[PDB]
């Protein structure tokens with residue numbers, strides 16, 4: 451499930467912005483993975499054409515990913 | 531009523547199709563914004579793939595647990611969290627009228643960053659009400675982590 | 690003792706009003722610090738809205754859980 | 769392609785002449801011009817006076833990190 | 844006083860002449876001298892060749908972020 455979410459949002463981000471650290475799927479996948487380990491980047495200093503759409507995508511990704519982590523943690527308590 | 535409490539997948543697939551149609555309309559109207567709609571149909575298009583986790587027992591139970599967690603506990607968490615965030619954002623904008631806290635949207639984003647461990651407590655700028663700002667930020671952080679703790683513990687009584 | 694262990698909400702609303710009155714006094718005394726008092730009142734004014742979670746069963750029980758978690762276990766951790 | 773001053777930016781168009789203009793963070797931002805760096809005038813805190821509690825230090829001074837800080841000369 | 848070249852630093856003494864010497868990260872560090880910035884000589888990967896997998900790009904080139912990256916000119 452995590453890889454499904456990651457690939458979907460990575461493709462959306464690369465399509466929306468095809469330049470400046472988001473010009474390939476590998477780099478975008480690594481940058482979105484960083485958010486899962488507390489090493490993200492939400493400074494938004496670059497002058498993108500579709501800023502304020504990029505922000506909504508990143509916020510939705512972060513919220514869904516943390517829902518998934520919480521659900522995993524809860525589900526693992528059913529074995530104790 | 532049944533749509534509010536049942537049959538969510540039909541709604542999500544329908545919303546995906548609506549975004550696609552809006553993208554087509556914008557495309558033939560000579561607008562650049564058709565991209566902005568298209569990506570929203572693309573991202574949803576991947577998440578809706580979890581619909582097909584039924585037909586496999588273990589993934590089906592997992593997806594049902596995700597659904598019920600979102601629809602039961604996360605709503606109660608997010609209501610209180612949004613109230614706290616809006617209150618402290620208005621307080622911070624009122625206290626500091628300029629310099630990354632000149633608008634409610636920017637302040638809301640800056641305070642949200644604390645919840646995910648990406649905050650900023652450097653206090654480098656020369657504000658007029660420094661040393662009052664610090665107290666507000668510390669109180670906000672402590673209350674937010676109390677709320678997260680209470681959510682986590684509340685989800686243990688359901689197991 | 691019953692003042693504090695019970696009826697917290699009365700104390701919180703009273704403290705909010707005290708901050709407002711101190712803000713007014715500083716405002717008419719030609720002091721700039723009134724803003725500080727004002728913002729604290731404003732902050733409390735939003736959190737006290739949690740008082741109205743009673744009258745709704747699920748939110749009321751959730752708020753009671755928050756109350757007891759703060760007043761029992763967090764105070765041991767912080768020391 | 770570009771947005772001019774007063775036009776909506778970041779919803780498909782970036783603002784041109786970025787050496788003089790910028791796009792704020794407002795969810796429907798309009799392109800705005802920069803402002804000159806006016807130095808700090810009076811109604812500031814001088815050396816030895818309390819800063820942070822409603823008054824910033826003047827341009828020649830800095831406010832340390834403390835509960836009751838006082839303006840001091842730069843390092 | 845300072846620690847001289849070859850003497851133990853960070854256990855009560857720092858190295859002097861920091862424009863030429865530094866104290867490494869070794870749990871019993873000794874003050875060491877800097878080295879000159881020698882440019883990349885032969886055995887490097889030239890433009891269009893695979894980098895990262897055992898060979899680094901030459902002086903004027905850079906290695907992108909990819910599974911199989913290829914050297915390309917700066918900018």
Ligand SMILES: CCCCCCCCCCCCC(=O)O[C@@H](COC(=O)CCC)COP(=O)(O)O[C@H]1[C@H](O)[C@@H](O)[C@@H](O)[C@@H](O)[C@@H]1O
Pocket residue numbers: 510535536537538539540542573574577578580581593597598600601
């Ligand atoms: C870019 C932004 C993306 C946002 C997407 C957010 C995650 C999407 C996940 C997609 C998963 C599809 C799915 O499987 O839909 C989920 C709904 O998940 C949600 O909560 C969505 C919240 C809105 C299950 O809903 P279902 O159609 O199975 O209805 C059930 C009945 O079948 C059953 O008989 C019972 O009556 C039961 O009580 C009913 O629930």
Ligand SMILES: CCCCCCCCCCCCC(=O)O[C@@H](COC(=O)CCC)COP(=O)(O)O[C@H]1[C@H](O)[C@@H](O)[C@@H](O)[C@@H](O)[C@@H]1O
Pocket residue numbers: 669694695696697698699701729732733736737739740756759760
């Ligand atoms: C800028 C900085 C802001 C700081 C704000 C700090 C959090 C605000 C939280 C706001 C919640 C308001 C509220 O509604 O207060 C809550 C209590 O939560 C707290 O205040 C915790 C303070 C520690 C309800 O307390 P209540 O008055 O209902 O008394 C109860 C009796 O009714 C009942 O019968 C029982 O006898 C029970 O033992 C009694 O308690």
Ligand SMILES: CCCCCCCCCCC(=O)O[C@H](COC(=O)CCCCC)COP(=O)(O)OCCN
Pocket residue numbers: 509634635638639642794795796
């Ligand atoms: C959970 C994530 C938390 C972090 C991000 C939260 C940001 C919320 C913004 C609050 C706000 O108060 O933002 C207002 C608009 O926000 C909206 O989009 C309203 C849509 C309705 C839903 C709220 C400000 O209005 P504006 O037009 O953008 O100001 C420019 C005029 N000068």
Ligand SMILES: CCCCCCCCCCC(=O)O[C@H](COC(=O)CCCCC)COP(=O)(O)OCCN
Pocket residue numbers: 668834835836837
């Ligand atoms: C959980 C998060 C904590 C983060 C902040 C840490 C605060 C501890 C400060 C300790 C101190 O010792 O702070 C002194 C006492 O003030 C107070 O703090 C009053 C309240 C004391 C009750 C707690 C301030 O002294 P000063 O301003 O540095 O004096 C100048 C001469 N140098």
Ligand SMILES: CCCCCCCCCCC(=O)O[C@H](COC(=O)CCCCC)COP(=O)(O)OCCN
Pocket residue numbers: 869870871
């Ligand atoms: C969980 C948190 C731990 C995070 C950090 C762990 C670092 C461990 C270092 C391993 C090591 O390999 O440390 C070696 C010995 O140092 C010691 O550490 C002594 C104690 C050994 C007893 C454990 C190398 O140090 P050195 O010999 O001084 O290097 C000079 C030669 N150039």
Ligand SMILES: CCCCCCCCCCC(=O)O[C@H](COC(=O)CCCCC)COP(=O)(O)OCCN
Pocket residue numbers: 474475476479480483909910911912
């Ligand atoms: C668990 C957390 C994961 C974080 C990092 C995930 C990165 C996934 C890469 C996706 C991709 O799409 O990566 C492309 C496909 O290759 C592979 O990587 C194959 C392995 C796929 C199996 C995972 C990169 O290929 P390339 O040739 O370097 O593209 C340059 C164009 N000439």
Ligand code: NA
Pocket residue numbers: 487488489647648
């Ligand atoms: Na972190």
